[PDB]
Amino acid sequence: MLKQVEIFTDGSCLGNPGPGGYGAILRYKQHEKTFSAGFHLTTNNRMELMAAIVALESLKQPCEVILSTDSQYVRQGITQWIHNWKKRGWKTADKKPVKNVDLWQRLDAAIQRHTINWKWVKGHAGHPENERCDELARTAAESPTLEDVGYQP
């Protein structure tokens, strides 16, 4: 692809666990799309992941993608754990499913589809789209419309 899809994502909750939401912005060929939804009861980690998942799932055909997020959880999973989670059949040694397996498997399916370059950002200052996503995540959390069916403590 001569030109790559740019994605920016964030998610958060109002207290953790609590109502939560995500925001994602995609830009390709100078066309921008936004996604945002709120959940009645969820976690920060689940919303940070959901933001990336929904953005990537919106690209139905394989794309070369640059995805910018300040999520530590997403970075940790992508850079440290997900190779091994998959190899272990998505279970820990006690044979329990890994935490947030539902969302990590959806992210893994998106990683199979797309050629993603991850940009782990720090701070909103040089990152206007990420700041917009932070606001979207909050306003969604202030007006949820979905149950997070995979949130299962």
Residue numbers in the entry: 1 to 153
What does the paper say about this structure?
RNH is a nonspecific endonuclease that degrades RNA within RNA:DNA hybrids. In this study, we traced the evolutionary and mechanistic origins of the thermodynamic differences between mesophilic and thermophilic ribonuclease H1 (RNH) proteins. We then reconstructed ancestral proteins along the evolutionary lineages that connect ecRNH and ttRNH. We observed that, while Tm changed smoothly over both lineages, the mechanism of stabilization followed a more tortuous path.
The other resurrected sequences are evolutionary intermediates at successive phylogenetic nodes along the lineage from Anc1 to ecRNH (AncA through AncD) and from Anc1 to ttRNH (Anc2 and Anc3). Our first goal was to verify that the reconstructed ancestral proteins behaved like members of the RNH family by characterizing their structural and functional properties. Using far-UV CD, we found that all ancestors are folded at 25°C and exhibit secondary structure consistent with extant RNHs. We determined the crystal structure of one representative ancestor, AncC, at 1.3 Å resolution and found that it adopts the canonical RNH fold, superimposing with the ecRNH structure with average Cα RMSD of 0.8 Å and with the ttRNH structure with an average Cα RMSD of 1.3 Å. Finally, we assayed the reconstructed ancestral proteins for their ability to degrade RNA:DNA hybrids using a simple hyperchromic assay to follow RNA cleavage and nucleotide release: all ancestors were active at 25°C, demonstrating that they are all functional ribonucleases H. The temperature-induced unfolding of ancestors along the mesophilic lineage becomes irreversible starting with AncB and continuing through AncC, AncD, and ecRNH. For these proteins, the unfolding curve does not reflect a strictly equilibrium process, so the midpoint of the unfolding curve is therefore only an apparent Tm. AncC and AncD have nearly identical thermostabilities, with Tms ∼7°C lower than Anc1 because of unfavorable changes in ΔHs (−4.4°C) and Ts (−4.3°C) and a favorable change in ΔCp (+1.2°C).
